[PDB]
A paper describes a structure:
Mammalian AP endonuclease 1 (APE1) initiates repair of abasic (apurinic/apyrimidinic) sites and other toxic and mutagenic DNA lesions and performs critical roles in base excision repair (BER) and single strand break repair (SSBR).
S6 Fig New structure of apo human APE1 with a focus on the remote binding pocket. For this model the resolution cutoff was 1.25 Å. The figure shows no significant change in electron density relative to that observed for the model refined with a resolution cutoff of 1.25 Å. Superposition of the structures for these apo forms of human APE1 (wild-type and C138A) indicates that the overall conformations are very similar, with RMSD values of 0.100 Å for backbone Cα atoms and 0.247 Å for all non-hydrogen atoms, with minor structural differences in the remote binding pocket near C138. A superposition of our new structure for apo-APE1 and a prior structure of Mg2+-bound APE1 illustrates that binding of Mg2+ causes substantial conformational changes in APE1, most near the Mg2+ site, as expected. Regarding APE1 conformational changes caused by the binding of compound 3, superposition of our two new structures for apo APE1, free and in complex with compound 3, reveals that binding of 3 induces minor changes in overall structure with some significant changes in the remote binding site for residues including L62, D90, R136, Q137, F162, S164, F165, and L318.
Residue numbers in the entry: 36 to 123, 125 to 318
The structure:
């Protein structure tokens, strides 16, 4: 049947590097679902990272065993503190966190054994905030994993509420849901597909309410359509901007005065997701 979507333009606004208080950004975090660490490195992802020059780089879907890291990661001197979590298994899921400065503490998982076996979460505590990066479980073809995803969602929200009770929290990564209709090009056709089910959208709303957390991009750009971070490799989707916003920076409300900008690096190639970048004046 005929596809209804042609190209929809989206030009990410210029980087706002000053907070509403006037304070210059001091922290630049980039998050990227890389669709396989080795594949992404061959597609020059590290060249892009070096130009972006973030203080912290969070990666999802590394698909790479913690004992099989590419040597090309050794040539990242500005991101020398590198932490990885991969399934306890090989070649799927997996996250990484690479940092210019050394975190006070690094932890893996959410403290719930059922949910900690698939290499999905790294927690890096710094002086003024705690950073979590996550690759949230996909609801699956035919929604066969939606029940598990709902259990994950509840355990993850409870875990994050606990962290944020002690230190301001930044959550980033691939949360595997487009929260609202503005967050994907085809809401009408996807309400029964992974990433846009009512259960997943409600889970995201529950996450924002319960921790609580604010969606940094949507806070700054509440009415901006066509801003996506993922496009299927098939069906010419990226060229038409038939996409989904699956990648987020969620922030404790106390960090909103420090929020300078939340960017979507639409033009950066190397995966079926693009990078997102957060500027904070901490």
């Amino acid at each position: 049947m005929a596809s209804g979507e042609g190209p929809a333009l989206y030009e990410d606004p210029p980087d706002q590097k000053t907070s509403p208080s006037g304070k210059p950004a001091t922290l630049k975090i980039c998050s990227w679902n890389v669709d396989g660490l080795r594949a992404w490195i061959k597609k020059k992802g590290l060249d892009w990272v070096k130009e972006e020059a973030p203080d912290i780089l969070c990666l999802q879907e590394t698909k790479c065993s913690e004992n099989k890291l590419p040597a090309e990661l050794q040539e990242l001197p500005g991101l020398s503190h590198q932490y990885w979590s991969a399934p306890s298994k090989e070649g799927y899921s997996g996250v990484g966190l690479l940092s210019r400065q050394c975190p006070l503490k690094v932890s893996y998982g959410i403290g719930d054994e059922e949910h900690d076996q698939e290499g999905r979460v790294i927690v890096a505590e710094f002086d003024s905030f705690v950073l979590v990066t996550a690759y949230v479980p996909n609801a699956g073809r035919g929604l066969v994993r939606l029940e598990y995803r709902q259990r994950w969602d509840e355990a993850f929200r409870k875990f994050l509420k606990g962290l944020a009770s002690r230190k301001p929290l930044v959550l980033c990564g691939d949360l595997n849901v487009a929260h609202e209709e503005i967050d994907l090009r085809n809401p009408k056709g996807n309400k029964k597909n992974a990433g846009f089910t009512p259960q997943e959208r409600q889970g995201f709303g529950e996450l924002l309410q319960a921790v609580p957390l604010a969606d940094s991009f949507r806070h700054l750009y509440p009415n901006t359509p066509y801003a996506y971070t993922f496009w299927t490799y098939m069906m010419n989707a990226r060229s038409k901007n038939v996409g989904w916003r699956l990648d987020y920076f969620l922030l404790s409300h106390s960090l909103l005065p420090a929020l300078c900008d939340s960017k979507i690096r639409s033009k950066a190639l190397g995966s079926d997701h693009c990078p997102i970048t957060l500027y904070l004046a901490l």
